[PDB]
Amino acid sequence: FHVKSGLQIKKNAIIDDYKVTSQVLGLGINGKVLQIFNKRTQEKFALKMLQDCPKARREVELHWRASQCPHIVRIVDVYENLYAGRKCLLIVMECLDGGELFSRIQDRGAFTEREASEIMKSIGEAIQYLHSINIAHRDVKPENLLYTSKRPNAILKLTDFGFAKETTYVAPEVLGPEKYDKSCDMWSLGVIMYILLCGYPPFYSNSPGMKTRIRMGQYEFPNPEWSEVSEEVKMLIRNLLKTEPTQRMTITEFMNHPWIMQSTKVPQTPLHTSRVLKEDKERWE
Amino acid sequence: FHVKSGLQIKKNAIIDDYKVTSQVLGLGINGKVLQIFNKRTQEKFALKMLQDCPKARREVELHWRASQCPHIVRIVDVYENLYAGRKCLLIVMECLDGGELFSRIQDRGAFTEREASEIMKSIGEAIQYLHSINIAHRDVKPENLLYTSKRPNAILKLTDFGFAKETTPYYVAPEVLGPEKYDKSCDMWSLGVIMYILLCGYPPFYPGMKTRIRMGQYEFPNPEWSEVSEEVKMLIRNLLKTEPTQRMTITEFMNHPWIMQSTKVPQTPLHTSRVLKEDKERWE
Amino acid sequence: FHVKSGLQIKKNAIIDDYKVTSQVLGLGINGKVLQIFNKRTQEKFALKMLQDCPKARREVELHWRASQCPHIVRIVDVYENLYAGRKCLLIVMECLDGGELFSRIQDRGAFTEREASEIMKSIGEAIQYLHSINIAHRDVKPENLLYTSKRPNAILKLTDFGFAKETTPYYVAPEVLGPEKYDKSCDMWSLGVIMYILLCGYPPFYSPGMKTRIRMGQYEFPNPEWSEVSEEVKMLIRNLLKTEPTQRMTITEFMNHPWIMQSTKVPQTPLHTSRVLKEDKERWE
Amino acid sequence: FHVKSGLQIKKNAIIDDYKVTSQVLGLGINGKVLQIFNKRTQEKFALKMLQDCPKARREVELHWRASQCPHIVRIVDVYENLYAGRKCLLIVMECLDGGELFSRIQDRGAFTEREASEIMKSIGEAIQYLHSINIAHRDVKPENLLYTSKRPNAILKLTDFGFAKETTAPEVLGPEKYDKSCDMWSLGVIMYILLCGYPPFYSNSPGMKTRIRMGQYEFPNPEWSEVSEEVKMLIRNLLKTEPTQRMTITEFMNHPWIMQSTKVPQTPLHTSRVLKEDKERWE
Ligand SMILES: O=C1NCCc2[nH]c(-c3ccnc(-c4cnc5ccccc5c4)c3)cc21
Ligand SMILES: O=C1NCCc2[nH]c(-c3ccnc(-c4cnc5ccccc5c4)c3)cc21
Ligand SMILES: O=C1NCCc2[nH]c(-c3ccnc(-c4cnc5ccccc5c4)c3)cc21
Numbered sequence A: 001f002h003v004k005s006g007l008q009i010k011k012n013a014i015i016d017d018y019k020v021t022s023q024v025l026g027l028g029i030n031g032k033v034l035q036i037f038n039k040r041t042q043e044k045f046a047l048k049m050l051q052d053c054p055k056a057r058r059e060v061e062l063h064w065r066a067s068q069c070p071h072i073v074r075i076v077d078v079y080e081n082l083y084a085g086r087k088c089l090l091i092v093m094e095c096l097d098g099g100e101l102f103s104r105i106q107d108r109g110a111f112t113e114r115e116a117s118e119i120m121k122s123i124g125e126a127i128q129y130l131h132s133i134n135i136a137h138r139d140v141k142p143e144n145l146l147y148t149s150k151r152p153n154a155i156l157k158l159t160d161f162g163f164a165k166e167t168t169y170v171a172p173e174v175l176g177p178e179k180y181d182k183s184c185d186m187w188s189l190g191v192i193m194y195i196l197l198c199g200y201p202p203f204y205s206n207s208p209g210m211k212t213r214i215r216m217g218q219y220e221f222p223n224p225e226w227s228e229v230s231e232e233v234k235m236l237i238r239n240l241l242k243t244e245p246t247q248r249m250t251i252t253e254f255m256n257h258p259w260i261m262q263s264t265k266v267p268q269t270p271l272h273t274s275r276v277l278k279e280d281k282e283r284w285e
Numbered sequence B: 001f002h003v004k005s006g007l008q009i010k011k012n013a014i015i016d017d018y019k020v021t022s023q024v025l026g027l028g029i030n031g032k033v034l035q036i037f038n039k040r041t042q043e044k045f046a047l048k049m050l051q052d053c054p055k056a057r058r059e060v061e062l063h064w065r066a067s068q069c070p071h072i073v074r075i076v077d078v079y080e081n082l083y084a085g086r087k088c089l090l091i092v093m094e095c096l097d098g099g100e101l102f103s104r105i106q107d108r109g110a111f112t113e114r115e116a117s118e119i120m121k122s123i124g125e126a127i128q129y130l131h132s133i134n135i136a137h138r139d140v141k142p143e144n145l146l147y148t149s150k151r152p153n154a155i156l157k158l159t160d161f162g163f164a165k166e167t168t169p170y171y172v173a174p175e176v177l178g179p180e181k182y183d184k185s186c187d188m189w190s191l192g193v194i195m196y197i198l199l200c201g202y203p204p205f206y207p208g209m210k211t212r213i214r215m216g217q218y219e220f221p222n223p224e225w226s227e228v229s230e231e232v233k234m235l236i237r238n239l240l241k242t243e244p245t246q247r248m249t250i251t252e253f254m255n256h257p258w259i260m261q262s263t264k265v266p267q268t269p270l271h272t273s274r275v276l277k278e279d280k281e282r283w284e
Numbered sequence C: 001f002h003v004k005s006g007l008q009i010k011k012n013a014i015i016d017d018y019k020v021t022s023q024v025l026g027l028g029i030n031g032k033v034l035q036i037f038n039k040r041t042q043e044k045f046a047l048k049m050l051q052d053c054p055k056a057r058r059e060v061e062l063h064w065r066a067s068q069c070p071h072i073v074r075i076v077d078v079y080e081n082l083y084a085g086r087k088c089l090l091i092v093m094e095c096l097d098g099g100e101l102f103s104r105i106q107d108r109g110a111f112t113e114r115e116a117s118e119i120m121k122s123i124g125e126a127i128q129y130l131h132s133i134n135i136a137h138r139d140v141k142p143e144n145l146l147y148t149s150k151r152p153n154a155i156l157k158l159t160d161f162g163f164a165k166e167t168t169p170y171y172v173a174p175e176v177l178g179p180e181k182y183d184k185s186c187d188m189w190s191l192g193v194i195m196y197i198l199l200c201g202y203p204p205f206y207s208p209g210m211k212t213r214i215r216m217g218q219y220e221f222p223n224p225e226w227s228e229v230s231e232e233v234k235m236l237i238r239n240l241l242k243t244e245p246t247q248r249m250t251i252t253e254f255m256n257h258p259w260i261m262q263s264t265k266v267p268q269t270p271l272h273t274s275r276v277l278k279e280d281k282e283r284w285e
Numbered sequence D: 001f002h003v004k005s006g007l008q009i010k011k012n013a014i015i016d017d018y019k020v021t022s023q024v025l026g027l028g029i030n031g032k033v034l035q036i037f038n039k040r041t042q043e044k045f046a047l048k049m050l051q052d053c054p055k056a057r058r059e060v061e062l063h064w065r066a067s068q069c070p071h072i073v074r075i076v077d078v079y080e081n082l083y084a085g086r087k088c089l090l091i092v093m094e095c096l097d098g099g100e101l102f103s104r105i106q107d108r109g110a111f112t113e114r115e116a117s118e119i120m121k122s123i124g125e126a127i128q129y130l131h132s133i134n135i136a137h138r139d140v141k142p143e144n145l146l147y148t149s150k151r152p153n154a155i156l157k158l159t160d161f162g163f164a165k166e167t168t169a170p171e172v173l174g175p176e177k178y179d180k181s182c183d184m185w186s187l188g189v190i191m192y193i194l195l196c197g198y199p200p201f202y203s204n205s206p207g208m209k210t211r212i213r214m215g216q217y218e219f220p221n222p223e224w225s226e227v228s229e230e231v232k233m234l235i236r237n238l239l240k241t242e243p244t245q246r247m248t249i250t251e252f253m254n255h256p257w258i259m260q261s262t263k264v265p266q267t268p269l270h271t272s273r274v275l276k277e278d279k280e281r282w283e
């Protein structure tokens, strides 16, 4: 018998409890994230500021539901305050000061296929939880994957529920409608996996002609980066990047794929990612 | 960085915390106001009783937002209780025992143009705050303006949000930033009617009254208005425009020199004080 | 920087510039095609006559757009004239006197699997261009596939846009970039049907119980015709003729298939097509 | 009898006639503006690239109609081409290499009340023309005001019809909403900046949004201490929050401060310096 507590929205002023700096930690889909400090405990946290409405209410609601998952940024508290005579949802979440996923990769000198497998597995676990409780994330990108600390054993966490949406013998179609909201995360996972293995996206710019290469599904595994990467992985990427949403792999089939399943049985083959990523600081702005 | 705390609705029985008398302190647009006493502290407060529904929820919500302003009656606590098997919003507010604005004026024996300017400025300040946070009061009348105490330095405060309504890149016109109808300009009319009474003791509008209002027929008759400066008559004339869009905005009003420099307005005495008691009859 | 010129509709009478014979060169979905001669140059061209309306305007507009592709019949000029007191779009296009695709195949005495691969690749290229500019052809059939000349190095070209229709950050999924129904996947079926006929000489769907065999997906690879054809090709055909539109292969997947990719590494195995086609002149009317 | 010619859209490829560089000359509301050169004549022009649709068709249509006005950027040619298999309106317009209005002010070391009057008058003329042919611009801002050359006698010209809209006793002759009066506000904002170097509505934010709807601004010293009460009064009247209380373009062009530009005091303004001294919060 597992129940978890529901969300108690705090109504007192947030400045009673926290010292709010104006150092920006990230730009969210609807409002920025600031650095804040626990007045009593001195410890550091992140504050996301949203203007109260049905949209913001849903973000908080869905995020809170997912907050249980180890690979989703944890909500610490939610405040409802008045800010310049308008209502506000202020979300306090744990501080992910390990930085973005591709910043950590970008800082070495090498990255291996086995480590890419481990990273993909923990992203996968976040998506798997979300899908199992009928939530599509709809915005799984590089900027939304951050690490808890700089320490080498930090946990990778998924952030930002600004685009998240609820997805609702007896066959699965006969148990509630459900459109393509979910399969759209599976594409993201494909795009991230591709970047993790070579350092660049599968879809380029040069650029209104990028938009067509995406709908056509024109990409490649060019050498030298991909010459080492096993056909088994390319085949997995090929399957997450199908242009037809229903041809795409589901999160359960993904988590059961042998490359993800047995992360520790994946060859230690080194990838170019680490260098290709710093060597290309320009067109990453 | 100013945040103010939001509204925490108490759910325990109000009678745990307050002794509720049944002395009526006023009749609100939707429910009366009773005198109550803090059980622990002995101190006196006012309780407004509302039946829970979307209407009452908005009154509380809007009033709480405005409660910060120094010239708006301060909400102390909001209770949600069961009263005769129905849900209830009970609002506890500070006690305004100085009485109504025109009751204080009515009790002397003289009132001056400069004081009228100081009164008008503090009503203005309440309206100014409301408008700035996108709330129209829609019911600014003599009965809604009360004083905190009888002491001569008491603050004047506005009450009753029963009619209040909400009114909704960097060089953009005000019309292109959200629709907004005439909700606000309607307070500006009240302000003109109050100002008129403040300076002479009777209203500017006396079934043929209904048409004099829509026509805009009123005057500044003597002897009351013969001392009053043309500058003030001109300001009243402009708040009482029958066409809502021709009417002055609350910012233009707070910037008008008569309101701006209250202390440079002539000390000229008005008839208000006497005309008001001399006319106790047709004020019921 | 590639721009190509847009469409200038000529308004002068077409008979100023061309001699119009009444030899019919084909029947289009909305108006027949006549043989005409350039008055000044003596050279031969084809004229398609359409009655001006939103439908005909779209054909011209879409055909002009695709006219740049090497494997699509080239539009020479478009006239807007009065014919019997009604407005008219007259389209002048290059003369494809090499005749229909299956007429050329039918005239030998043998056809090989490698040539079928080369034909399919060039039809594919036309579809690929169209899809990449968001146009579905919707009428890819034997009669719409003609050769430029009789000379053995002639180019195969696609005609008739009477059914053609338009089909409408940087990690964003293909579904989230505009709706789009099954218009395109319907060309992919035609490609399968054409490929099947090219390898054996008859259609996969035969002689009101035909209508049900198509929706059921009942067809075979009967002997003796199909006994030489590699399992690789049968598998590609099986995948284009999927009854469920979304299970069907996309044009990019198709142009990447090794059988199409390396036309010149396909076995030179002879097919029955050439003979089966003339031997069955009857039920082809 | 004055007829002017209508718009002939050229259908041939633009690269036949022009050499198209990719030096960006400005960012428009729907597509950027590039520097191009007349292949035959060597002369320089600006190209705006739009994707064909009803929106872009209207921009070109409305712009063409206003192109006659001396104070509106002149369209040279309009091409309809295929770019990556999609149709395209390409607009060639005269090259305004004198740069933006506030860049030219920002480059001296002084600006006078009389010159501000002359600038406001020529912006007003553009709006006046547009309104008289029933078009509201709806996007009169600092970036849309450019000069033809650097030469000191250059003409100031208005650009960008991406937001322009057609606007159809005076009330009995066709409906018409507040489209027009919204240009009149821009005119006030621009006049304010021209006289002191900063906007009337600040950031430092979500509280700027409310100061605009409330109409809270001032004429603070030292900048405004020389500026005549007559001008402050005109600005006050363009910046009325109520659109119908706002002055019309005809009333504006008739105001004595605009009418007799050359009888306006030569009083120097702070604008020139306040503008460079505040390069930061202007990005
Ligand atoms: O919801 C979101 N969307 C936009 C991106 C984002 N970051 C966060 C976030 C959450 C918790 N911590 C951080 C954070 C903390 N400290 C950092 C230090 C250095 C780099 C990045 C950091 C991010 C960011 C939340 C969101
Ligand atoms: O919202 C309202 N509706 C209608 C009028 C009103 N009066 C009040 C009010 C609020 C607080 N205190 C008082 C009050 C208290 N004590 C008094 C003593 C003597 C005369 C008047 C008094 C009013 C009235 C609230 C409202
Ligand atoms: O759009 C169309 N509608 C359906 C059939 C068609 N044929 C053509 C066409 C176009 C250009 N040339 C020809 C042509 C010319 N000469 C031929 C000689 C012998 C056989 C077929 C021929 C076709 C046909 C166009 C269309």
Ligand SMILES: O=C1NCCc2[nH]c(-c3ccnc(-c4cnc5ccccc5c4)c3)cc21
Residues within 6 Å of the ligand: D025, D026, D027, D028, D029, D033, D046, D048, D073, D093, D094, D095, D096, D097, D098, D099, D100, D143, D144, D146, D159, D160, D161
């Ligand atoms: O439609 C528009 N909207 C966005 C801004 C813009 N600039 C232009 C424009 C038009 C003509 N010339 C230029 C131009 C020419 N030369 C320049 C030199 C230096 C700086 C800016 C320049 C702009 C810009 C049009 C538009």
